[PDB]
Structures are given as C-alpha cells and as structure tokens.
Design a protein around this nucleic acid. Structure first.
Lengths: 60, 158, 143, 73, 190, 137, 103
RNA sequence: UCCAUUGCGACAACGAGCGAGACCCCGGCCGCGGGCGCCGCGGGACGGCCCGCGCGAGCGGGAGGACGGCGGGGCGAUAGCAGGUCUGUGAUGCCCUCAGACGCCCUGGGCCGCACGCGCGCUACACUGGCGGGGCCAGCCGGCGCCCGCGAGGACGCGCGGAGCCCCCGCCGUGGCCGGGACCGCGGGCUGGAACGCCCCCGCGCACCAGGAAUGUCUUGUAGGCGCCCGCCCCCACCGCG
C-alpha cells in the first residue's frame, strides 16, 4: 500500500519500439536486497532512484 | 555604430595622451560582436564605462552580474586600483558580459606572484568559467532553401 | 482628478447630437462615440475650450457643455487649422468646414448622386459593389 | 456582462472601500478590484490616499505592479 | 561561506533542501547567482541540465508562448513579484515552497506503448526523476498561463497562487489535478 | 559632472527650472501637433516642450565639441509606424519643433554655430554643470 | 623636387598583388618609401538562378569578385618627377595589376 | 566495425583507377610584420593523454585546452528521363510569314477584368497588452548643413554619417473598449511627356474571442520574436538573396 523506492544497479538498454522504455535491474534499499527487473520511461542513469507503487511486479 | 575592431578603440585615442602613458595595463573581453577595452592603473577604487560609473548602468537587474567579480574576489584589491572601460558592439547583455570578462582579466593581470594568480583563477573559475574564457558560439549564416539557417519553406505535396 | 466620490451633479448618461454617451469613461474617448469626431480632433476642440481632458465625462458641468459645443460648430473662427477638418474644400461653397452626424449621410449620399449623372467610372462600380481603388479582385473578397 | 463603476457614492468610500481592506495584511489594485467589484483606477486613488495616511507601506514598486503591507495590523 | 547569494538580494539559499530522495540530487539549490540569468550553454550534454539552477529552469518556461519568445527580463521581474507575494502570505522562504511544489507535482507512473501492443494495449511504467521535475515545472507554468488569459488579474498572482496550492497538495491546483488524472488512468492500464 | 546622475531626474529638474526662468516659451503650434508621422496621437502632458528642450541640450553637451544638425536630432526621437496590414517600418520625427528649440537656445547664446550644425558654447556648459551639481544632492 | 606623390594598386588575385609589393618596396628602400596601407576588401556579389528558366527546385549561384588595394604614398619629397620612373621600371611588370600615380 | 565499397581479417584470385575522404571559402585562440581604413604571412587539434574493453580496426567514460571527435557552405562519380527550355542569343535542322507583311515604327486599350475552388505569405484576436514621454546599444555596410512647411515634401550649400525589441515614469482596467484597421469621402504633394502608380492629414471604423476533417518545419546562438540593407525599379516590397 505504501510505495517504496528502488535504486538502479545497472541498465539493460532500450527495448520498446520507437525507443523510450528501458529495462532496469533494481534493488530495494528497504533492506531486503531484492534484485529484480522493471521498465522505465525517460532518461535514467546508474544510482538513480525510482518510486515503485508495487512491492511486487515482474516484466521481461 | 562602432565596429569593435577600429584602431581608435584598441588604442583608446579618446584619452588624452599625457595621461594615456599612465595606464600601464591593457585588456580585452568579448562575447558576440562586442568588445571591451580596459586601460588600468593605480587608484583608490573607481570604475567607469563610457564615462559612466559602474552602479549607474542600464541593466538595473544585472548590476550584480557586472559586480560579481568584486564580491567573489573581495574589495581591497579593487579599492587598490582604478579603471576606465570602453565598450562597443551589439546589444546590451553582450556588452555586460564583455565588460565583466574584461574586468576579471584586468584585475587578474595586475598581481605579480603567479601563484596568487593561479589561486585566484581557481577560486574564480569555480563560480563560473565564462568570466575568464570567451564564449565561442556566434551567429550562423542562412541558406536559400528558406528564411532561416535550418528551417525551410513549408512544402505542399498537393 | 483625485476624484473619488461622485459629484452631486455627476450625470450618468449624456446626450448630444442625438447621440448618448456614458459618464464613466474619460472625456476625450467618450466624444469619439460621435460621427465626425476622433481623438485628434477632440483634444484640439476641448483644449481651445479651456476644458480638462482627463476628467470622467459624466462630471462635465452644463456650462462647459455649451462652450464645447460652440467651438465645434465654429471651428475655424476659433483658430483650429484647416488641415484638421474632415471637409476641406466644399464643391459648392469652396469653404473648409467640419460636418457631423446629421450631415455625413447627406454629404455622402449626395456625392454618389453626382457621380451617376456624371457617369464616372467610379460611380458605376459603386452600384454593382466592386472596388473603386485599383485592388485586384480575382481571388480576394469572396462573399 | 459585468459592469463596474469608477466613482464611489459618498459612503461607499468608507463603509467597505476602506473599512474592509484595513483588516487585510497585503493587498493589490487588482485584488481590491475583484473584491469590491470596482475598476482599478479608483483603487489606485484610494491606495494613494492610504499611503498618505500611513497605514500601508510599499515593499515593491513598478509601473506594472506595486504592492503594500499593512503596518497598522 | 565567503559570500551568500541572496537571490534578488533578499532571500538566501542557506537553510534550504528537499525532502524527497528520488529527485534530491536532480535539483540544484546552491549554485544560484544573484540573478537567474546565466549564459550557460545548458542542454549540451544529456544530464547537464540537472545542474541548472531550478529558478532559471522555471523562468525559461514562462516565455514558452510564441508571442513572448526571447523575453527573460520580464520573467525575472515576474518571479521576483511572486516571491514577495509568497513571503507575504506564508512568512517563510519562497524557495522552500518552490522546491516542495516541484516535488509534489510530477507523475510517478504513466502509460506507454510497449512491444507491439496492438489495439491500444498500453502497459504501465514508472518514471525517472528528470522527467518528474520537467513535468512539474511545465505544469506549474502552464497552469498559471491558462488562468491569466483574457482575465483581469496578472500573471504573477496566478503563478504564486498555483505554486502555493501545489506545495499544499490541494487538488484545486491544475498541476495536482493533471498528476492525479494521469496516475489513475495509468493504474487502469496496469 | 552630469553623467554621474540618471537622465530622468536631471531632465525633469532642468525643465522645471527652465519654465520657471522663462528661458524658452511654447509657441502656438505646440497644441495641435502629434510629434512625428510615426506617432498616433498627441502627447498627454502639457509641458513636454520643456522636457524635449532639456533632453536636446543634454545631447548637445554630451557630444561636446562635435557638431549636430537638426535632422540628426530627429533620428534620436523616432518610433515605429503601425496600422497598415503591412510589416512595420521606422520613421523620422518632425524637425520644426527641434528647429524652434535650437533657435531659441542660440538666441540666448547658450549654443554657438559652426561650419555645419551647431555645438555647445562654454556658457551652456557652465549652466548645465551648475544645475547638475545643484541636483547632485 | 618635392611633390607629395601617391601610388595606387588594384587587382583581383592576392598573389601577384602580394608579389608586386615586395619588389616595389625592396626597390624603394633608398628613396625613402615605406610599406603599404592594406585597404578594406571590396566585395562584389551576384546571386543568379542556376537555370535559364523556372523549373525544379530553386537553386542559386553565388558569384563574387574580390578587389585588393595597396597604397604607397610615401615617396613625396624623397622622389622627384624623373626618379619616379626609376621605381616603376625595375619592378616585375605583371600583365594585370593597374598602378596609378598622383601627387 | 564505419554516417560512408570507411577500415581489420580471409577467400581462384592478383594488381590498379574514379567516386568518398583529401581539397577551397568563412569564423572562432595565439605569434610576426605592416598600417589613412585592421590586413598580409604563419602556428594551433591529431581519436594526441589516462582508464576500460576488444588480436584488430575501433567503441564508453575522464581530463587540460579557444575549439573534441563529419562547425557552416562550395565542387560533386557510371548510367539515364521522350522531365523543362526553339519566347536568351549572329545556337540551330525541317515547315510557314515574306510589300494591304507574323518584317520595323506610332496612337489608344489589355495582361490587374470576378457569383466561384487552393498554394506560398502578411496582419490580428489583446493585460506576458495598447497609448504618451524619456534613456539607450548592432552587422552586411553606410552622405550631410541651413531655411520653409503639422506632415509628406520643397529652395539653397557643402563633404560628412547608424534601429527596433528592451529598460524607466505614467494613462487605460476586461467592455468587438483606447484591441483590429479593411472599406469608403473631401484635401495637400512626388514620379513622369502623360496617373490608372505612391506618400501625408481629417473623418468612417468590415470580419476577427485561438480556428473541423486534414497537414508542415525543427536539436545552440538553433526555433521563435524584432528590425536593417541590396535585386529588379521613372514612383512602388506583404517578394527574394543576405
């Protein structure tokens, strides 16, 4: 219910047609070290912080 | 009305010659089509543009932009000496930046211990780099395809 | 000016030359509501009258209303030049006059009457509704 | 649509135009226009009268915009 | 330090920060000159605008309209007026309010066209800090721009009201409404 | 000197002094003119003549020994013509007013002619500096 | 004896005009002549349609003619009427570089 | 791998060439000389240095530097189109005109004519504004004084010279109103052999409240906004090259 935030460890490059979206590998600095995947729109770089309204969702 | 390359300017034949020989230093600043010539000497903290003091300039909003080097560098140095800049070229803002560049270089040309000069250069460039290095970009020409450098006349396929 | 509260005689709507004028607009602009008057003519008219120009029109006392009227039917004699008049060399009088609302319709309507009998090129085009000047009409002004 | 005057009648230059602003802390010509539904010029005149009194002080002045503060509180 | 850059020679930048962490570093609050007019050749690299002083970013969007193109002096004057108004209503530093507002706007989710997505198949995705700040700024400026067209009151008052409301998070403001609409519609597609 | 004060204060103060001293007088034609083909309506103020005169004498002082003609003064009071469904263009002011002002100033010997145009005389410099210092504080 | 003379030089190529100069100045060291005053370049410009008719895309030619000018007037008293010819002969006459003289 | 048949490494192929790049003009930084007037000759930047990778060619990041990785233009391969041009020419083949002439010259008129469909543009829909006064800076480049006349312009006489936006002070105060200036009615002037052409003054004061289906251009001194010079030209720029 309470959106958390995740930090970027790396980047997996553009995927979506017409560019834009980029896959990413994040981890929860909430303390669980859950390395997962997500998609992002807009310029992004390493160490950036995202806001995830989902404690749990998967893409690929 | 003044081109910025005229011999009368880089020499400053405006000043009377007997006093001219006192202004040991010379300097230059620019931006776009705008030139600044600072003849500097010893004084008690005074400055002038085209026979105008520094406070009573037209950028009532950018007066601090002109004064920046004074505040970032301190006051005793500028109080030490005196100036009389002249400027000529396109626009108002261009002239403002030309002037501030000229002031920075001229005051920084006065010291004699190059270690102090380096320390001051480092202190100053940190705040901004364009107070010491001229801006290169300049107006780009236009082409006959349309009425602008890169834009083109609107094309109708039907 | 510096007038906050309304003058006891402040008149909210004024009538002149069969035209009605408001009492909240400034005087020089209000008079523009009439036909035959504009901004340039008006100031040159009020000023000769020793009238102020930045006073709301409704607060114009009655005495000023007449003298203002007097200098408007008798412009030239009061001094105003002959190049500030809407009618400079009348066809019959040869005079220099300034004509107003009751007259514009007649002097104009009577002008075209003279052009039809004279058979000028201009008069005919005033009939079928074309352009009297030399404007091109192939692709413009399409009703 | 909306009509506004430019000339108070006697008592409206006191019952509201003044009595109602003095409570305010910061005011402006257009604010007082939209509040009292009267055109701006009258607001300029009245504010001049007030600074003449001394209840308000200018903080930022300019042809486009000048604003005041209520010192009297 | 040696000098404090009192903005417009009134309000300082000392005890100022941002609460949110995601965009804390994408907001420059310390390299403000006395006047938000720098000839910096920003927008040259890909991430250099993240160092532009936030206020200059703000003013550079107030002259977006075609008629008002190339007019920065009026923009600086407008911004100064708005800052005085904010100080007079709130009593605190307007810069704090501006940063809080830019943080409280900006969507945290938006819909895009991923893969083939035939037949309007739009998935949901999260958003990067830079786009968040950009959209927040653009929304504030556009909201103030929409209120003051063919209206009596000036642009500055609308600007300041919008900014304070957004800092409050009230739905009454235009930016907050836009953000909520976008977030919700994207949730539908998630 | 004079350039150590903004023009706005100096111009108005000098014009008031001038009107008080009767140095120059508004002729009749000053009350129906529009001041330039560019301009659209006539001036609002009733004492613009004196302001213009003050500005002109200040301009003659600035140039010092250099000479100015009337038509060269008209190009410093130009503007932009509008209302023609056509791109705007720049136009020169009228020179009758300027001629009146310079002729009156010269009649008072504040302004000595040369080969071409006219240039300030030392009396004019004396007076201008005197008032400049008078308003300095 | 003494007359205060001027030398004009005109040309469209920069090489000969920079070669005539060296010869003349080398020849005049004794008579007291001094270097030139390189004058502003005169730029002739013509834009013409690249086609003899209106067709296709509208493409333009941009022709120009540069004219260079060097002026030695430093002979004067150092050179008399007859001695001027001494200087206008030893130089290497070039087929196109009009040089005019006028006190 | 490269923007690029640009390169590395192989192969019944070996060895070459054009095109590309190289090249020329412009500008940015520095040096020398010369000088009525800023104009002549040179230097400088090369994927050179550090770090990663990659046999390699080369890719990503960081430095110092005026400029950092094809900065803007010109030239532009083989082959071809029934593309346009006989109305540019003492460039032209074949036909037709050739003494009541399609030859050449003069007088008037037309190419501008208007119920209508659209292509490139200009002006506006206003307060991020309009009006009045004042202050003030460009570059391709460049001519001024005195006197009359509101102005446009005019009579004399000499060689001398730069604007809009913008900033400041005030008026207006949401009203198709001082926004907008089309249309039309007297008048004063210029050009020219001759106004149908062009300017100035007073008056009148059309639509127009951001524009549907459709669609165009654009990545740094760029878009957009503002104005200024030349071309044709007896007068005339909402056009075009800059």
């Amino acid at each position: 219910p309470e959106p958390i935030n995740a930090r970027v460890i790396e980047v997996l490059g553009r995927t979506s047609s017409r560019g834009g979206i980029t896959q990413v590998k994040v981890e929860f600095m909430t303390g669980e070290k859950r390395q997962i995947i997500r998609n992002v729109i807009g310029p992004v770089r390493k160490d950036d912080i995202l806001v995830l309204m989902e404690s749990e969702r998967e893409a690929r | 009305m003044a081109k910025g390359n005229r011999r009368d300017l880089l020499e400053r034949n405006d000043i009377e010659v007997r006093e001219r020989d006192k202004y040991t230093v010379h300097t230059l600043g620019k931006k776009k089509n705008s030139v600044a010539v600072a003849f500097v000497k010893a004084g008690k903290g005074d400055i002038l543009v085209n026979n105008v003091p520094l406070a009573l300039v037209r950028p009532e909003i950018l007066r601090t932009k002109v004064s920046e080097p004074i505040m970032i560098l301190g006051e005793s140095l500028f109080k030490g000496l005196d100036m009389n800049i002249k400027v000529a070229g396109g626009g108002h803002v261009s002239q403002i930046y030309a002037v501030r560049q000229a002031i920075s270089r001229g005051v920084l040309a006065s010291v004699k211990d190059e270690a102090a000069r380096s320390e001051l250069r480092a202190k100053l460039v940190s705040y901004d780099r364009q107070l010491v290095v001229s801006d290169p970009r300049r107006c780009e020409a236009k082409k006959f395809g349309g009425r602008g450098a890169r834009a083109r006349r609107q094309k109708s396929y039907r | 000016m510096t007038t906050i509260v309304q003058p006891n005689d402040y008149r909210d709507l004024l009538r002149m030359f069969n035209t009605n004028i408001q009492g909240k607009v400034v005087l020089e602009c209000a008079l523009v509501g009439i036909k035959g008057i504009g901004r340039r003519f008006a100031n040159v008219a009020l000023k000769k009258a020793n009238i102020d120009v930045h006073k709301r029109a409704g607060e114009l006392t009655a005495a000023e209303e007449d003298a203002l009227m007097k200098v408007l039917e008798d412009p030239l004699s009061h001094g105003i030049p002959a190049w500030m008049l809407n009618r400079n060399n009348d066809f019959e009088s040869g005079k220099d006059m300034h004509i107003l609302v009751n007259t514009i319709a007649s002097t104009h309507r009577a002008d075209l009457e003279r052009l039809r009998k004279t058979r000028c090129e201009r008069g005919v085009r005033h009939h079928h509704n074309l352009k009297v000047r030399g404007q091109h009409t192939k692709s413009t002004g399409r009703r | 649509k909306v009509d506004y005057p430019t000339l108070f009648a006697d008592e409206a230059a006191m019952n509201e135009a003044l009595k109602f602003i003095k409570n305010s802390k910061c005011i402006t010509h257009t604010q007082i226009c939209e509040r009292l539904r009267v055109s701006v010029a009258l607001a300029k005149r009245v504010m001049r009268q007030l600074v003449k009194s001394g209840d308000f002080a200018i903080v930022s002045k300019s042809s486009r915009m000048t604003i005041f503060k209520n010192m009297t509180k | 330090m040696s000098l404090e850059v009192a903005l417009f020679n009134k309000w300082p930048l000392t005890d100022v920060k941002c609460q949110d962490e995601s965009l804390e570093a994408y907001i420059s609050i310390d390299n403000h000159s006395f006047v938000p007019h720098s000839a910096g050749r920003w927008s040259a690299k890909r991430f250099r605008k993240a160092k532009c002083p936030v206020v200059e970013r703000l003013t550079n969007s107030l002259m977006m309209h075609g008629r008002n193109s190339g007019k920065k002096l009026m923009a600086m004057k407008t911004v100064g007026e708005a800052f005085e108004l904010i100080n007079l209503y709130t009593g605190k530093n307007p810069v704090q309010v501006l940063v809080d507002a830019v943080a409280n706007s900006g969507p945290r989710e938006d819909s895009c066209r991923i893969g083939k997505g035939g037949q309007v198949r739009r998935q949901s995705v999260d958003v990067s800090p830079l786009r968040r700040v950009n959209i927040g700024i653009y929304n504030i400026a556009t909201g103030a721009r929409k209120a003051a067209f063919r209206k009596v009151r000036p642009f500055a008052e609308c600007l300041a009201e919008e900014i304070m409301n957004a800092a409050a998070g009230a739905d009454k403001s235009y930016a907050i409404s836009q953000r909520n609409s976008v977030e919700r519609i994207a949730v539908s597609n998630r | 000197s004079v350039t150590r004060v903004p023009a706005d204060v100096f111009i108005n103060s000098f014009a008031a002094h001038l009107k008080n001293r009767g140095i120059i007088k508004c002729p009749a034609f000053t009350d129906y003119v529009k001041t330039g083909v560019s301009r659209q309506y006539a001036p609002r103020d009733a004492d613009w003549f004196y302001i213009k005169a003050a500005s002109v004498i200040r301009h003659f002082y600035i140039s010092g020994s250099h000479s100015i003609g009337v038509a060269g003064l008209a190009r410093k009071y130009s503007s932009l013509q509008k209302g023609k469904t056509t791109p705007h263009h720049t136009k020169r002011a009228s020179c009758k007013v300027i001629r009146s002002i310079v002729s009156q100033f010269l009649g008072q010997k504040l302004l000595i002619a040369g080969e071409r145009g006219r240039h300030i005389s030392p009396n004019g410099r004396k007076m201008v500096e005197d008032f400049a210092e008078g308003l300095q504080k | 004896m003494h007359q205060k003379y001027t030398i004009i030089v005109v040309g469209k190529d920069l090489k000969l005009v920079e070669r005539y100069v060296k010869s003349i100045v080398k020849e005049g060291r004794a008579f007291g002549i001094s270097g030139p005053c390189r004058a502003p370049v005169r730029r002739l410009t013509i834009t013409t349609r690249k086609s003899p008719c209106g067709e296709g895309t509208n493409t333009w030619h941009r022709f120009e003619l540069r004219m260079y000018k060097r002026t030695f007037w430093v002979t004067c008293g150092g050179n008399d009427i007859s001695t001027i010819l001494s200087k206008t002969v030893v130089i290497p006459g070039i087929q196109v570089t009009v040089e005019v003289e006028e006190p």
